[PDB]
Coordinates of C-alpha atoms in Angstrom, one line a residue:
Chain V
X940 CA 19.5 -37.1 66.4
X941 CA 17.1 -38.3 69.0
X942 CA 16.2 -42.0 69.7
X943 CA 12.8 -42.6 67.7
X944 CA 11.0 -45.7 68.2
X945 CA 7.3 -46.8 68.9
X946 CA 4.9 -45.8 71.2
X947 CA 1.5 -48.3 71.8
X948 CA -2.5 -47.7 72.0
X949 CA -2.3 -50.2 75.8
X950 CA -0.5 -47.3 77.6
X951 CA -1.7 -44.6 76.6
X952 CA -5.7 -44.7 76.3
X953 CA -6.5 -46.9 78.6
X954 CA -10.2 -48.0 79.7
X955 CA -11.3 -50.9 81.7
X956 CA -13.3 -52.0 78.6
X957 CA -12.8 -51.7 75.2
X958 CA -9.0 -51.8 75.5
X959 CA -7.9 -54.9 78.0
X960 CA -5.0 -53.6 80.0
X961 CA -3.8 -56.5 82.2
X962 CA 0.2 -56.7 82.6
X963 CA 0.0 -60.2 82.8
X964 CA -1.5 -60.4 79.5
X965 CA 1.0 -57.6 78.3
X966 CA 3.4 -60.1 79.0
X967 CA 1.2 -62.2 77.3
X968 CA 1.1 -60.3 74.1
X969 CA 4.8 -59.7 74.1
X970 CA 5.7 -63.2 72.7
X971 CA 4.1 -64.1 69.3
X972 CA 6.3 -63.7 65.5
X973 CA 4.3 -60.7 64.9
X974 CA 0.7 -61.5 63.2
X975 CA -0.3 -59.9 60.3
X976 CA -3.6 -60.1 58.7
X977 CA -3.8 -63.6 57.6
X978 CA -1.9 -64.9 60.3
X979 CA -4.9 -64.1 62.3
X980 CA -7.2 -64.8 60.0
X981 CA -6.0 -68.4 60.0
X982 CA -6.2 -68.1 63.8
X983 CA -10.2 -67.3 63.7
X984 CA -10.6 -70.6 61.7
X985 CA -8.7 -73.1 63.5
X986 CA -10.5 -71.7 66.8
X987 CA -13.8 -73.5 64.7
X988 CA -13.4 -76.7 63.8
Chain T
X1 CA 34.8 -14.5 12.2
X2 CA 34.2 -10.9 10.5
X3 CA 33.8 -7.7 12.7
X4 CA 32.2 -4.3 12.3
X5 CA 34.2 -1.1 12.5
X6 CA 31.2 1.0 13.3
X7 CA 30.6 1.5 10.0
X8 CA 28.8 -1.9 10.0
X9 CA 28.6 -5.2 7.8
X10 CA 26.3 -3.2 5.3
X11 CA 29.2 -1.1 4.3
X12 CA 30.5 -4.3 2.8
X13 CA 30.5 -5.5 -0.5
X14 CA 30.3 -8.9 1.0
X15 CA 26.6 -8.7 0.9
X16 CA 25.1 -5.8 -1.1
X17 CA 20.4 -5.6 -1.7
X18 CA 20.7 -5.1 -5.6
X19 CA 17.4 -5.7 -7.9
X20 CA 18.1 -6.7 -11.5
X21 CA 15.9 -5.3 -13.8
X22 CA 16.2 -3.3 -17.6
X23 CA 18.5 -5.6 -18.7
X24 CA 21.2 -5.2 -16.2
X25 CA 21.5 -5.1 -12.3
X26 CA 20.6 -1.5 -10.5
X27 CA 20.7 -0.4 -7.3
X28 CA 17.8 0.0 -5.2
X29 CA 18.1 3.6 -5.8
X30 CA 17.9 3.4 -9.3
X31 CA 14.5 1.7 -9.4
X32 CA 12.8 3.6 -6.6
X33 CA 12.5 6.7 -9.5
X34 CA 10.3 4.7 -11.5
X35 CA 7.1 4.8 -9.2
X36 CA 4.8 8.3 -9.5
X37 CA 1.9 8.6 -8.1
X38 CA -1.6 10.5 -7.2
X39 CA -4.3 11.0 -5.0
X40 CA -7.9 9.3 -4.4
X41 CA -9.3 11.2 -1.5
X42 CA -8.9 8.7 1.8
X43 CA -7.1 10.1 4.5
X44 CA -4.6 7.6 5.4
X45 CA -3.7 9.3 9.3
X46 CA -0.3 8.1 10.8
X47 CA -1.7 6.2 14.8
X48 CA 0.5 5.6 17.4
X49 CA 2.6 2.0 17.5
X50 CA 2.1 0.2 20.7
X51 CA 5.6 -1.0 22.3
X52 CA 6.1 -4.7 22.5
X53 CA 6.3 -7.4 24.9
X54 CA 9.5 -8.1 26.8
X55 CA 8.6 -12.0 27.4
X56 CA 10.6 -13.9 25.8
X57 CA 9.4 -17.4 24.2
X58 CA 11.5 -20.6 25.1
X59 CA 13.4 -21.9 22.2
X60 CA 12.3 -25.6 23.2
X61 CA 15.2 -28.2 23.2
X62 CA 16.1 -28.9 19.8
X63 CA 19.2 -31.2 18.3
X64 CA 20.5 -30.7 14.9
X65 CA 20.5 -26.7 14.2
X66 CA 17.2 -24.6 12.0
X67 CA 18.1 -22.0 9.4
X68 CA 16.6 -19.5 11.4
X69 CA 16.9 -16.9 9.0
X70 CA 15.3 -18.5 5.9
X71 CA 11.9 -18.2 7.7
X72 CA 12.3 -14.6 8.5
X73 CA 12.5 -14.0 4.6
X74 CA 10.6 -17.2 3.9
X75 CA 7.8 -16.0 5.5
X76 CA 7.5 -11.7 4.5
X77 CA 8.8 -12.1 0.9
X78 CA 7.6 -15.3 0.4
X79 CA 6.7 -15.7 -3.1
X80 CA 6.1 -19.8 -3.6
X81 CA 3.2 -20.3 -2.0
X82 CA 3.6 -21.0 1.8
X83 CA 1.3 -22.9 4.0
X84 CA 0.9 -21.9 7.3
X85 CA 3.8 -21.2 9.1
X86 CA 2.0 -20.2 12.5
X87 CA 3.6 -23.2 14.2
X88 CA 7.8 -24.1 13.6
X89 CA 11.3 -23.8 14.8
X90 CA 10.8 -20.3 14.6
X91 CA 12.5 -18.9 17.9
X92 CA 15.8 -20.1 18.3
X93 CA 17.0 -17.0 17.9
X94 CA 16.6 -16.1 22.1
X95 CA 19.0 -19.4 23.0
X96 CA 21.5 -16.4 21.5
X97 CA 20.2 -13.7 23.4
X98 CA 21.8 -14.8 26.9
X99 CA 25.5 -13.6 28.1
X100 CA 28.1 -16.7 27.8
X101 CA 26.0 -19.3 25.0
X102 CA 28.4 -21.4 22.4
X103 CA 25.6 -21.4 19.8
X104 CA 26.8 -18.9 17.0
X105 CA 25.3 -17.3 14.3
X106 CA 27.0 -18.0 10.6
X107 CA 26.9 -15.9 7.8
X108 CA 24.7 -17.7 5.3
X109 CA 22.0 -17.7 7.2
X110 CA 22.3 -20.3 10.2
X111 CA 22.2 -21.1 13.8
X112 CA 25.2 -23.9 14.7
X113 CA 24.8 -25.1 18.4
X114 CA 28.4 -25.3 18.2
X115 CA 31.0 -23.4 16.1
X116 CA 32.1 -25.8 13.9
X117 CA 35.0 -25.9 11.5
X118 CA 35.4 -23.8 8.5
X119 CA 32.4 -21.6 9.3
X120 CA 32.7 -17.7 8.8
X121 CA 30.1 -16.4 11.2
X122 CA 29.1 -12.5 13.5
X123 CA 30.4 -11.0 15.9
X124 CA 28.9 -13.1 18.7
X125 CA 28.7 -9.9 21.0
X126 CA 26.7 -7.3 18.7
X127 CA 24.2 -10.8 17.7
X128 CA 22.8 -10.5 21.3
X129 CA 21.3 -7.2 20.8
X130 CA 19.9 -8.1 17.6
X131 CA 18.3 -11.5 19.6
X132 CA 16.9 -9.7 22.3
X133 CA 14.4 -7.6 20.0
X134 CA 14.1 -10.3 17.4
X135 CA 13.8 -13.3 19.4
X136 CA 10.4 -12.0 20.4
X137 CA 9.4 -12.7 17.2
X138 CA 9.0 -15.9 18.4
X139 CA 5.2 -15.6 19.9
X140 CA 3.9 -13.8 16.5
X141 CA 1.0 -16.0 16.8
X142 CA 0.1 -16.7 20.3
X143 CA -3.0 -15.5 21.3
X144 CA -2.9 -11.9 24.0
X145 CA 0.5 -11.4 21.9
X146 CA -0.3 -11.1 18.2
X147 CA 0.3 -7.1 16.9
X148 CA -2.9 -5.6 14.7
X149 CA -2.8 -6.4 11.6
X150 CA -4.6 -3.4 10.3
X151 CA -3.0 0.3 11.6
X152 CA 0.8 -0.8 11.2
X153 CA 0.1 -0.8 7.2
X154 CA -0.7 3.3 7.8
X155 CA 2.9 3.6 9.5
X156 CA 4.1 1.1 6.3
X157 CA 2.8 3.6 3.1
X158 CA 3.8 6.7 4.6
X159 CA 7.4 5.2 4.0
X160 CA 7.7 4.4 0.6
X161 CA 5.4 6.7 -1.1
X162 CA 5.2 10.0 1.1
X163 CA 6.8 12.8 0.1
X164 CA 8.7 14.5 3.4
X165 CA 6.1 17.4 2.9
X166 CA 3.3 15.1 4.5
X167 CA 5.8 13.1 7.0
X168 CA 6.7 16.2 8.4
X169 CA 2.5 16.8 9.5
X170 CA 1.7 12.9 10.1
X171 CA -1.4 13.1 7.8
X172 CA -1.4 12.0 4.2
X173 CA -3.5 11.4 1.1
X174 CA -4.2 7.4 0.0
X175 CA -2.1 7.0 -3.1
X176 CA -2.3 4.9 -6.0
X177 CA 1.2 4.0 -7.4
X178 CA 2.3 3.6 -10.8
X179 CA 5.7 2.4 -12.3
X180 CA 6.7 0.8 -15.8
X181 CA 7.3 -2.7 -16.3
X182 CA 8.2 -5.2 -18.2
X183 CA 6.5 -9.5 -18.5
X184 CA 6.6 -11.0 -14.5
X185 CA 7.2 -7.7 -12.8
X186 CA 6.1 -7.7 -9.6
X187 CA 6.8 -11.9 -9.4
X188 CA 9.9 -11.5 -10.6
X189 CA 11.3 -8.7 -7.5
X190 CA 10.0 -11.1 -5.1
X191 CA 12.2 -14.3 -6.3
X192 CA 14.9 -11.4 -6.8
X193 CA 14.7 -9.6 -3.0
X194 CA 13.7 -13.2 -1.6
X195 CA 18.0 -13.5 -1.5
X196 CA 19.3 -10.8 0.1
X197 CA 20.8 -11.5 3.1
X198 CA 18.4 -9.5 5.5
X199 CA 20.1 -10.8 8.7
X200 CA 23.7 -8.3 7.1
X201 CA 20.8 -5.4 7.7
X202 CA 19.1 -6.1 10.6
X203 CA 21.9 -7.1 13.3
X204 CA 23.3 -3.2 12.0
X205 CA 20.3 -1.1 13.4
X206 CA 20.7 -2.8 17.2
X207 CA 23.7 -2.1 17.4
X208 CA 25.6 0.8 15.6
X209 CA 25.8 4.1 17.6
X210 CA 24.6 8.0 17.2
X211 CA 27.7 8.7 15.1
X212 CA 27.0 5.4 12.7
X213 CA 23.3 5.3 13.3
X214 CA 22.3 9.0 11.7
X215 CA 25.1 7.9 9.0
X216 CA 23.4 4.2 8.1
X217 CA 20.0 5.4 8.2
X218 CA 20.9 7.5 5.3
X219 CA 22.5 4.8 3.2
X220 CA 19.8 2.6 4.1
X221 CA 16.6 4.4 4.1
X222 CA 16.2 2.6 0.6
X223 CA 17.1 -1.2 1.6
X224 CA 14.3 -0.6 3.6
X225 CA 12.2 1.5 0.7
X226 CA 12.6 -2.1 -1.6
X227 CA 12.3 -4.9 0.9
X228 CA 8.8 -2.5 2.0
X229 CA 7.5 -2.6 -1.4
X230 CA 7.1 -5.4 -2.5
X231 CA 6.0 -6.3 1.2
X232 CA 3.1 -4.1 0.6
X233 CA 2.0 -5.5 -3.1
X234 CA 0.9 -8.5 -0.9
X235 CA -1.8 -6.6 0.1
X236 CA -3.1 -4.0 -2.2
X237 CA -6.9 -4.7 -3.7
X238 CA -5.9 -4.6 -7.4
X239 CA -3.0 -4.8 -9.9
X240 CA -4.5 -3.8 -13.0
X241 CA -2.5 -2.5 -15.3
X242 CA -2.6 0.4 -17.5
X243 CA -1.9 0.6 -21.5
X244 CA -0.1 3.2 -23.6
X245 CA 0.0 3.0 -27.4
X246 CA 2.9 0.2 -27.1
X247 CA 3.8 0.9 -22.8
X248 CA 2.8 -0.9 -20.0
X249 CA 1.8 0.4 -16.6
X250 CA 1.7 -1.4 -13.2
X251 CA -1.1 0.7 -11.4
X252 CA -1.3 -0.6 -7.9
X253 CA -4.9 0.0 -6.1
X254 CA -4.2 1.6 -2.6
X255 CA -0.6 1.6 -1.4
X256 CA -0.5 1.4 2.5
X257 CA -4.5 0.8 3.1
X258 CA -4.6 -2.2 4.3
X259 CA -7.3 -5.0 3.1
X260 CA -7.4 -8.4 3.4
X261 CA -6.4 -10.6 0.8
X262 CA -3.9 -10.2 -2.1
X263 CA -4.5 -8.8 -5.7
X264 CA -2.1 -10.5 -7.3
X265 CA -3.6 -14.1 -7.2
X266 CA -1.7 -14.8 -10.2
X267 CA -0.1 -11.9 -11.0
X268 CA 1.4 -10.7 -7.6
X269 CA 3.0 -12.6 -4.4
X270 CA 0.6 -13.7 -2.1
X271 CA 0.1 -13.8 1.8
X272 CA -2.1 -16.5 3.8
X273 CA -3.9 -15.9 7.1
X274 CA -1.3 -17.5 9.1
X275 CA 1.3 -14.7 7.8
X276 CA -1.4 -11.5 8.5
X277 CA -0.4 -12.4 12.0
X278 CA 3.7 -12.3 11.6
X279 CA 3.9 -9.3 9.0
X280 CA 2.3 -7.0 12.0
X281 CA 4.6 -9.1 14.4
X282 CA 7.7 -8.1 12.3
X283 CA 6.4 -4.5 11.1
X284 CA 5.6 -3.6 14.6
X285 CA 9.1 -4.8 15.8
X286 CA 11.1 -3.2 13.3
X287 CA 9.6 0.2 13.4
X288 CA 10.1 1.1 16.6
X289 CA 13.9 -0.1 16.5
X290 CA 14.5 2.0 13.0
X291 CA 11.9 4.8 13.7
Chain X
X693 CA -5.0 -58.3 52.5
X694 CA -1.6 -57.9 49.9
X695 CA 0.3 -55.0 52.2
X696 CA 2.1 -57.2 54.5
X697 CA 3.3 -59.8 51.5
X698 CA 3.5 -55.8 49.2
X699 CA 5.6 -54.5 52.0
X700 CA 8.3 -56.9 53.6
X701 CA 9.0 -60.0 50.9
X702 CA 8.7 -57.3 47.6
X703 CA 10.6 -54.5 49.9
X704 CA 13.6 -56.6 50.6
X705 CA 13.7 -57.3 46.8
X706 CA 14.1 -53.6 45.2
X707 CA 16.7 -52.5 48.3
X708 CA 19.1 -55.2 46.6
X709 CA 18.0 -54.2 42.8
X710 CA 19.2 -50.9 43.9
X711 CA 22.5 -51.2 43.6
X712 CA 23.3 -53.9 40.7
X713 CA 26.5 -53.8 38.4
X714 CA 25.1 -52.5 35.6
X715 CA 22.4 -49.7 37.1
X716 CA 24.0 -46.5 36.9
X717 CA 21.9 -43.3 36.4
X718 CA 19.3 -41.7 39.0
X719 CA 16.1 -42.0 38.7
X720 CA 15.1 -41.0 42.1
X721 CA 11.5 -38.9 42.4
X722 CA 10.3 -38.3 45.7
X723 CA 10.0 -34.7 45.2
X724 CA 7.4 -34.3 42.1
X725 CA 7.6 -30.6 42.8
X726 CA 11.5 -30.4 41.5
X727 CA 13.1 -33.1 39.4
X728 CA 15.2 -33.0 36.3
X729 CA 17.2 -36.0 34.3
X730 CA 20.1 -33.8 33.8
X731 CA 21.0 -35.6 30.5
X732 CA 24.8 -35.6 28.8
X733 CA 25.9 -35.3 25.6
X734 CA 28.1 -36.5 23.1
X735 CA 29.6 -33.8 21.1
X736 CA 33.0 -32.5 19.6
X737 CA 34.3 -29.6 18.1
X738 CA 34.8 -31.0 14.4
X739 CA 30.8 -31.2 14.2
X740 CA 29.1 -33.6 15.8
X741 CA 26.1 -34.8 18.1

């Protein structure tokens, strides 16, 4: 045994650009029913009109 | 579920190798005295034999069971004509040629997967012997496995029609053999030997021992002499045959040279391409075990 | 732009299909290096098969 679970690219990697690492929006970003790809495909559309 | 007391199923009048000719049935033996021959002036040299391959081919999975040993006959005394036979069901022998196996050999001339009722059979220990030298009879036609179909046939003629005088030196003069005859001849031995139970003969020289080995090759140095004869008639470049004043002679060309395709035609047995291949497979097997 | 609907609502439907009433035998192959159907037969003494 050993606990496995998941790691993330936001700790690990970090830049100032290219990879936006604000807690606030970590918190942010920890909220949504998991998006998949058309999800946010739908979201780049109602962003439009 | 017969068994051997050393002296071996060929000292049984179960099965006895007979030839009926001149009116009656006669022994091998008896017919043998019949063929005198000459000399044409061809050294026919005995070569070494190369030993065979220990692989063993895979007797694929098959249901229902092959009468493996009508081939073996099927194929070297052959006299109907017979297609190629390169391909078949013609290794089922080596599913008998590990330790603990159920499939049995019967007498007859079958392979049951399973003893079944009412079926005399061998002695499933001295069978496994006779598999794992036969069995490789299997890949007779495979290519890098195939024995020479050419220098076996001067190890072949040496046997029948050599006088111990040359045996004994390992050089003889090419002979061409004459016997008497009657209408078929030569036709007529091959749909006579073709039923002869060959597997009672075979399964006897893998396993009898020194004491019952020097002893059956004495009493069977002449089985061998018949079922070797007519083998070699399949080959011979003519069968032409002499005329007294009211006699018939069956001159055969050249005994144990080896050419290419059969004299008879019509008047002799006849081989096929496909069987050049397995009487060197077989020839070459069986010498080494009986020589 | 199939994975997510390939991978989640099809997923969920062979994990049940695994293990109906009448499914029996194995067919399992995630080893192509070593895998046999280890077949039975039917066959008695009195000559049959």
């Amino acid at each position: 045994r050993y606990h496995e679970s998941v790691l993330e690219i936001a700790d690990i990697f970090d830049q100032a650009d290219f990879i936006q690492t604000s807690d606030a929006v970590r918190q942010l970003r920890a909220l949504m029913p998991t998006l998949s790809t058309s999800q946010i495909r739908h979201a780049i559309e109602r962003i439009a009109q | 579920m017969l068994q051997q007391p050393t002296g071996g199923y060929t000292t049984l009048e179960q099965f006895a190798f007979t030839i009926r000719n001149d009116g009656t049935n006669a022994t091998p033996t008896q017919f043998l005295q019949l063929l005198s021959y000459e000399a044409t002036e061809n050294e026919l040299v005995k070569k070494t034999i190369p030993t065979p391959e220990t692989h063993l081919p895979s007797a694929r999975n098959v249901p229902g069971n092959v009468y493996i040993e009508d081939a073996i006959t099927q194929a070297l005394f052959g006299i109907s004509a017979q297609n190629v036979n390169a391909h078949g069901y013609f290794s089922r022998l080596s599913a008998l040629a590990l330790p603990n196996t159920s499939a049995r050999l019967g007498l007859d001339g079958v392979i049951y997967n399973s003893e079944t009722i009412n079926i005399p059979f061998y002695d499933p220990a001295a069978v496994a012997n006779f598999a794992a030298t036969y069995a490789k009879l299997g890949n007779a036609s495979t290519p890098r496995y195939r024995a020479d179909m050419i220098d076996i046939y001067a190890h072949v003629g040496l046997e029948l029609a050599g006088t111990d005088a040359e045996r004994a030196a390992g050089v003889m003069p090419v002979k061409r053999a004459k016997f008497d005859s009657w209408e078929g001849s030569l036709i007529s031995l091959s749909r006579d030997v073709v039923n002869w139970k060959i597997l009672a003969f075979l399964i006897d020289l893998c396993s009898l021992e020194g004491e019952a080995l020097r002893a059956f090759k004495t009493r069977n140095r002449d089985v061998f002499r018949m079922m070797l004869f007519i083998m070699s008639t399949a080959v011979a470049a003519n069968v032409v045959n002499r005329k007294v004043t009211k006699r018939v002679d069956r001159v055969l060309e050249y005994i144990g040279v080896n050419s290419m395709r059969t004299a008879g035609r019509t008047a002799t047995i006849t081989y096929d391409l496909s069987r050049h291949e397995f009487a060197a497979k077989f020839l070459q097997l069986t010498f080494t075990r009986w020589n | 732009n199939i994975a997510v609907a390939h991978t989640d609502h099809l997923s969920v439907v062979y994990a049940t299909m695994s293990n109906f009433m009448l499914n029996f035998t194995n067919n399992f192959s995630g080893n192509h290096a070593t895998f046999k159907p280890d077949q039975y037969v039917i066959t008695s003494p009195e000559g049959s098969y």
